[PDB]
Design a protein around this motif. Structure first.
Motif, short mmCIF file in Angstrom:
data_model
loop_
_atom_site.label_atom_id
_atom_site.label_comp_id
_atom_site.label_asym_id
_atom_site.label_seq_id
_atom_site.Cartn_x
_atom_site.Cartn_y
_atom_site.Cartn_z
N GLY A 168 19.58 67.59 10.69
CA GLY A 168 18.43 67.88 11.54
C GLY A 168 17.09 67.28 11.16
N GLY A 172 16.36 63.89 11.89
CA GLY A 172 16.18 62.67 12.66
C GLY A 172 17.42 61.79 12.64
N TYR A 173 17.71 61.17 13.78
CA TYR A 173 18.86 60.28 13.90
C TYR A 173 18.40 58.84 13.69
N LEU A 196 14.59 55.40 12.47
CA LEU A 196 14.70 56.53 13.38
C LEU A 196 14.64 56.06 14.84
N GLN A 216 3.46 64.92 15.79
CA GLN A 216 3.64 65.27 14.39
C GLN A 216 3.50 64.01 13.53
N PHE A 252 4.31 61.93 8.18
CA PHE A 252 5.19 61.16 9.05
C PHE A 252 6.59 61.12 8.43
N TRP A 309 15.49 58.07 6.34
CA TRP A 309 15.05 56.97 7.20
C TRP A 309 13.69 56.47 6.70
N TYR A 350 6.50 56.73 29.38
CA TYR A 350 7.41 57.55 28.59
C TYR A 350 8.63 57.52 29.52
N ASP A 375 12.77 62.74 25.02
CA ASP A 375 12.29 62.25 23.73
C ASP A 375 13.19 62.53 22.52
N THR A 385 11.59 63.90 19.14
CA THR A 385 11.09 65.28 19.07
C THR A 385 12.28 66.23 18.93
N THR A 386 12.22 67.12 17.95
CA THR A 386 13.31 68.06 17.70
C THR A 386 13.59 69.08 18.81
N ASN A 387 12.54 69.81 19.20
CA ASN A 387 12.65 70.89 20.17
C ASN A 387 12.62 70.58 21.65
N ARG A 398 10.34 71.43 24.31
CA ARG A 398 8.97 71.92 24.37
C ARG A 398 8.59 72.16 25.83
N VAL A 412 8.88 68.47 27.01
CA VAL A 412 9.49 67.46 26.17
C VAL A 412 10.94 67.87 25.92
C1 LIG Z 1 12.39 63.23 13.07
C2 LIG Z 1 12.50 64.72 13.58
N1 LIG Z 1 11.32 65.05 14.37
C3 LIG Z 1 10.50 66.12 14.21
O1 LIG Z 1 10.68 66.93 13.31
C4 LIG Z 1 9.41 66.23 15.21
C5 LIG Z 1 8.76 65.08 15.70
C6 LIG Z 1 7.76 65.15 16.68
C7 LIG Z 1 7.10 63.95 17.19
O2 LIG Z 1 5.89 63.91 17.38
N2 LIG Z 1 7.92 62.89 17.44
C8 LIG Z 1 7.40 61.54 17.67
C9 LIG Z 1 8.02 60.51 16.68
C10 LIG Z 1 8.13 61.00 15.23
C11 LIG Z 1 9.36 60.82 14.57
C12 LIG Z 1 9.50 61.17 13.19
C13 LIG Z 1 8.40 61.70 12.51
C14 LIG Z 1 7.17 61.91 13.15
C15 LIG Z 1 7.03 61.55 14.52
C16 LIG Z 1 7.68 61.23 19.13
O3 LIG Z 1 7.33 59.88 19.42
C17 LIG Z 1 6.68 62.03 20.00
N3 LIG Z 1 6.79 61.66 21.43
C18 LIG Z 1 5.61 62.25 22.10
C19 LIG Z 1 5.74 62.22 23.55
C20 LIG Z 1 5.93 63.51 22.81
C21 LIG Z 1 7.37 66.41 17.20
C22 LIG Z 1 7.99 67.60 16.74
N4 LIG Z 1 7.66 68.80 17.39
C23 LIG Z 1 6.24 69.07 17.75
S1 LIG Z 1 8.70 70.05 17.58
C24 LIG Z 1 8.61 71.04 16.08
O4 LIG Z 1 8.25 70.84 18.69
O5 LIG Z 1 10.03 69.53 17.63
C25 LIG Z 1 8.99 67.48 15.72
C26 LIG Z 1 13.75 64.99 14.34
C27 LIG Z 1 14.68 65.91 13.83
C28 LIG Z 1 15.90 66.15 14.49
C29 LIG Z 1 16.24 65.47 15.66
C30 LIG Z 1 15.28 64.56 16.21
C31 LIG Z 1 14.05 64.35 15.58
#
Ligand SMILES: C[C@@H](NC(=O)c1cc(C(=O)N[C@@H](Cc2ccccc2)[C@H](O)CNC2CC2)cc(N(C)S(C)(=O)=O)c1)c1ccccc1
Length: 379
Positions: free
Chosen positions: A17, A19-20, A36, A79, A114, A121, A192, A222, A225-227, A229, A326
């Motif tokens: 969990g 990131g892929y 990623l 994030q 980040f 990754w 997007y 997306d 993004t994990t969740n 939203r 999201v």
């Molecule tokens: C990598 C990890 N992502 C995360 O943990 C994670 C990443 C982001 C996030 O901002 N992701 C970035 C890229 C981006 C990628 C890596 C690092 C930083 C930014 C993405 O381009 C955002 N796209 C914006 C249009 C929404 C946002 C959140 N959330 C706010 S949440 C808690 O609601 O889910 C969690 C993840 C884990 C499991 C599956 C998929 C992604």
């Protein structure tokens, strides 16, 4: 049944969990890094200096084909954020298409929240459109370069398998990655991967909100993004309904806010007490829609075990947003998602690897009759 794209199957990995990612090789001689896959941004960037959370990084001085663009780039996400220097270099994906292209690459020299400790990754592949690329839309995204420089079809598909692996098929679709039919929703606008949600149900029960609320501002797919939203008003109504549906057991308010976790004895998680969630998406024919349904196994995510213990801790992975809906990994992990850029549409089918139990399964069903879907979009 068959598979001409077999070599691209299982080309994605993940650190539980976090990131892929897919392997990408840049420069000359070859420098392979774990990247990623992010359909929520449009910049291709790689760590290019040491960092506590990075095992390796891009060394530009060692690449004879590297070209400095003499311009900096800064990219802030929901994030994290990073700063780097723009340039171009040769890029190939070992377990992806059999081609090599010259693409824009941002060398990350500094970052804040980040990179993720233990994720494995070292960079990110922004797969969205040029409109949201930084510094501006003149910086051609990786996929645009791939399509312009080669004959690889303008399409890619993702199968994210949760709990870590999956597949990113580039230039086509692999039938072994899904069951049932693929249902398509239009890409409303190319920035997007924007889509339109027309109805939401919790255990078959309509949330009964004006559909404009579901897409207030926008709704996107997306993978970065994990969740799942949701806009404030939608989140609140969803939680109220989910709580009412799972009344067999009560949980602290913080659980629904992601602030608290709940753990169960290994293998005793009562998935049956939690409801299924259905999102209806606009179809390809007038007044026609279809729905994707996820299980609690998708929206209740495992939290890195303490140390191979006998307790399964979970976090409620549906949260609030102030920038629209999201559809992150929580949504994508239950399906094989086709990003058909050529035909401006996104397809969904039940994934051959989605996590489920012996009673319920993720589903993609249709068609349904939904009127006035066009008005659901934000202008
Ligand atoms: C990598 C990890 N992502 C995360 O943990 C994670 C990443 C982001 C996030 O901002 N992701 C970035 C890229 C981006 C990628 C890596 C690092 C930083 C930014 C993405 O381009 C955002 N796209 C914006 C249009 C929404 C946002 C959140 N959330 C706010 S949440 C808690 O609601 O889910 C969690 C993840 C884990 C499991 C599956 C998929 C992604």
């Amino acid at each position: 049944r068959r598979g001409s794209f077999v070599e691209m199957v299982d080309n994605l990995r993940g650190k539980s969990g976090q990131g892929y990612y897919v392997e990408m090789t840049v420069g000359s001689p070859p420098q392979t890094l774990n990247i990623l896959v992010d359909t929520g941004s449009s910049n291709f960037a790689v760590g290019a200096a040491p960092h506590p959370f990075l095992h390796r990084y891009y060394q530009r001085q060692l690449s004879s084909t590297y070209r400095d663009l003499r311009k900096g780039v800064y990219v802030p996400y929901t994030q994290g954020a990073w700063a780097g220097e723009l340039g171009t270099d040769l890029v190939s994906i070992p377990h992806g298409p059999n081609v090599t292209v010259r693409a824009n690459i941002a060398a990350i020299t500094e970052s804040d929240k980040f990179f993720i400790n233990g994720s494995n990754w070292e960079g990110i592949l922004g797969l969205a459109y040029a409109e949201i690329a930084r510094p501006d839309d003149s910086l051609e995204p990786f996929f645009d370069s791939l399509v312009k420089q080669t004959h690889v079809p303008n399409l890619f598909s993702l199968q994210l398998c949760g709990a870590v692996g999956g597949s990113m098929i580039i230039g086509g679709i692999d039938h072994s990655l899904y069951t049932g039919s693929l249902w398509y929703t239009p890409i409303r606008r190319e920035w997007y991967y924007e889509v339109i949600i027309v109805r939401v149900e919790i255990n078959g029960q309509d949330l009964k909100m004006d559909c404009k609320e579901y897409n207030y501002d926008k709704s996107i797919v997306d993978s970065g993004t994990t969740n799942l939203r949701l806009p404030k008003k939608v989140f609140e109504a969803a939680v109220k309904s989910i709580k009412a549906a799972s009344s067999t057991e009560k949980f602290p308010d913080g659980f629904w806010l992601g602030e608290q976790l709940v753990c169960w004895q290994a293998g005793t998680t009562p998935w049956n007490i939690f409801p299924v969630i259905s999102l209806y998406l606009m179809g390809e024919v007038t007044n026609q829609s279809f729905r994707i349904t996820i299980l609690p196994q998708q929206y209740l995510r495992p939290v890195e075990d303490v140390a191979t213990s006998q307790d399964d801790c979970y976090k409620f992975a549906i949260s609030q947003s102030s920038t629209g809906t999201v559809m992150g990994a929580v949504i994508m992990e239950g399906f094989y998602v086709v990003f058909d850029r050529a035909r401006k549409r996104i397809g969904f089918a039940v994934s051959a690897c989605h996590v489920h139990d012996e009673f319920r399964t993720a589903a993609v069903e249709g068609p349904f009759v939904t009127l006035d879907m066009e008005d659901c979009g934000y202008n």
